[PDB]
Amino acid sequence: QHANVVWDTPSRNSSESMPCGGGDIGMNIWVEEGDILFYLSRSGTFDENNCQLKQGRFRLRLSPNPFEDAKDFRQELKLIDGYVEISAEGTQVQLWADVFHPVVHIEVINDRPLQAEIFYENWRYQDRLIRKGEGQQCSYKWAPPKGTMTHADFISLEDSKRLLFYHRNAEETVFDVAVAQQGMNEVKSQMMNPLKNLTFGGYLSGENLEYIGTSDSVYAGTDYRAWGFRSLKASKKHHFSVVLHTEQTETVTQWEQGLKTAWQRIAPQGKISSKVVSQDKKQTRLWWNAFWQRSFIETISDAKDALKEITRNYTLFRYMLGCNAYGSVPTKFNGGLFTFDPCHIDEKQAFTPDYRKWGGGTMTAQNQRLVYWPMLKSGDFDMMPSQFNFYNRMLKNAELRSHVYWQHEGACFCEQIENFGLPNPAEYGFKRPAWFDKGLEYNAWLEYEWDTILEFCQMILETKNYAGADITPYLPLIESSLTFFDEHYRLLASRRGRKALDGDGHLILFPGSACETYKMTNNASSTIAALRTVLETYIKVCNNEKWQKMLETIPPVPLRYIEVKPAWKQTISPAKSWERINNIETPQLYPVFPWRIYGVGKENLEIARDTYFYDPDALKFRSHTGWKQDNIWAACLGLTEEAKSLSLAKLSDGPHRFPAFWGPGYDWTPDHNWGGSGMIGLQEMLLQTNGTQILLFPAWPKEWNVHFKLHAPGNTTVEATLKDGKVTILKVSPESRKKDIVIMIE
């Protein structure tokens, strides 16, 4: 038992919008001065500058409008069935997306016959020059070449099919620019190109509609054109469909064809088969019903109000993640699929609705990982490949890097990575010395940060461990990723000295970095904990000995002493050595999470706790904002009250009307690494794994009553309840695992 989001009065602007999606599609939906407005974003729609374009904005007006000064207004997110419902006296509108097909549906049911106008609004009707600061939404960031523009869409007026909109990419894209910049033209002809000719759009369609002409205005400081359709005859029912298609094609004909094929499915002889759309609808709702059975964290005086808040928000976010199961590319951290008009976020950055900070086809690994990690314990295993394929798609490209720059095998996956496997052109350096290594970013924050891929590698393996997933398509990726660290730091040492290993026969991890925070490291704890834990884990799943050899070559995690404001405390060191500090991450707790070397029910917990409580960089960097993992670590170290405080802070209502729209923090709104991280935190307070143990309530307060169900390794599922400090229930499946449970509530 939980709660939907119910607004009983209309919304003022696009920031006061509601998420709704499914499949690879996300809509922001709201009602403003009697109009039903929805933005429509789909995963993977990257322009020639690698900006994530929204497909458009949709407007629905009824006449006489029952939403004008309406009594009994109600916009409701109907979680269980994954659809939004807007209703007022004798009218009921439903919006949903098919989970199994790229199609949005609007349904109107009126007691009396009403008239309906539907408008398709597109602000890319003509070329628009990228203004100062607008580059952040693309790969050029702060330095878009003079005369760089967002190219125009192709709208046109030709069954029930009415309107055709699409954007098409040219042959020349930021890919070709970046290939040149980083000197890989030699091997360009062997590289996957995600952007060349990439085309994406669809049909607006309905029965009982005529065209009512074009019209021009401004929505949120953004000029736009609108095409309008009006129903020939008033009617008790009205049904509109939007049908999308995405593809790289030699001609526009080829693309159109694929769109037609998708359109025919739902309109076999030109009309929208309400038989077919009923199956689609039924399927979709079952899927959502199943969705809310995979996992949950629910409740059962303002203490309870606050718990309800975070559990509610935890859930609302999970909905948002759900909207992009089966995306070809992952839910992005910086807005996801639910960006709105920038001006509501920052007036200095008031650009098109296609705008967000930190790029579109450009995705920072450290953020992306926080979106996905929580999908293991929530059982959302089928969504995670969206994230895995992103990297698998560019494995050949990331390898050709290492071939070109250092003539060795293995994939070089930079931190701020494009969808084509090279680092972001801007961060690589536009004004860089001729002599500098072509494989290295001319960058103080990013140089030698290649280790986040290993977190995704761990995710892949953990899908096997948690859900028996078939991960055969990924093994090459995992192997190539490890091969790099071995072949790189061997070669670097052999070029510098006579020995390629240290005197303990271990790898010499220099130059490295501990995330983006400690730079030019020797033997960072973060990178080590990773190689150790990935290899340990990949050994259990591969008899080959090359991997046990390499595990023996991994140096130990470095520790150190710190004085306390005497007495000395022993903590985890950032690294054996570093040159400087350029950020506010805390990679000396990466052995706590993600790699779970230290943690509850594991050795030397006192070391980790002291790192959390006394490392003065960690103290200084502690926070609940954005990606800050202090909430996670607190929980993994069994510090309730600390975890309680942070998780309260992290998951409490965001600044917009929908309460799980958090941001912008260090990123963009809706911040998804905010949600993601926050999920992780709540999850770890309840359930942790320690070998084959399942530790329940490791960092959960007695006075928080809870009913949850989370996953654990070996297709295991734990449903439990705490009430007035008693574990009143336990339902465990398979039952053989019930004896592995350890209750920790004291």
Numbering used by the authors: 21 to 178, 184 to 325, 346 to 610, 622 to 802
What wording appears in the published article?
In this report, we present the 3D structure of BT0984GH139, alongside its homolog SDT91673.1GH139 from Verrucomicrobium sp. GAS474, an organism isolated from forest soil. Both proteins adopt a three-domain architecture, consisting of an N-terminal β-sheet domain leading into an α-helical domain composed of a core (α/α)6 toroid structure. GH139 enzymes operate via an inverting mechanism in which we propose that N412 functions as the catalytic base and E561 acts as the catalytic acid (BT0984GH139 numbering).
The B. theta protein BT0984 was the founding member of GH139 (BT0984GH139) and is specific for the α1,2-linked MeFuc in chain B(6). By 3 h the anomeric signals had reached equilibrium. These data indicate BT0984GH139 produces β-MeFuc and performs cleavage with inversion of the anomeric configuration of the α-MeFuc linkage. In BT0984GH139, a triad of Trp residues, W162, W403, and W490, lines the putative positively numbered subsites, providing aromatic stacking interactions for sugars within the Δbt0984 oligo. D723 forms hydrogen bonds with both N412 and N729, at distances of 3.3 Å and 2.9 Å, respectively, suggesting it may fulfill the role of activating N412 to function as a catalytic base. Surprisingly, overnight endpoint assays revealed that only one mutation in BT0984GH139, E561A, completely inactivated the enzyme.
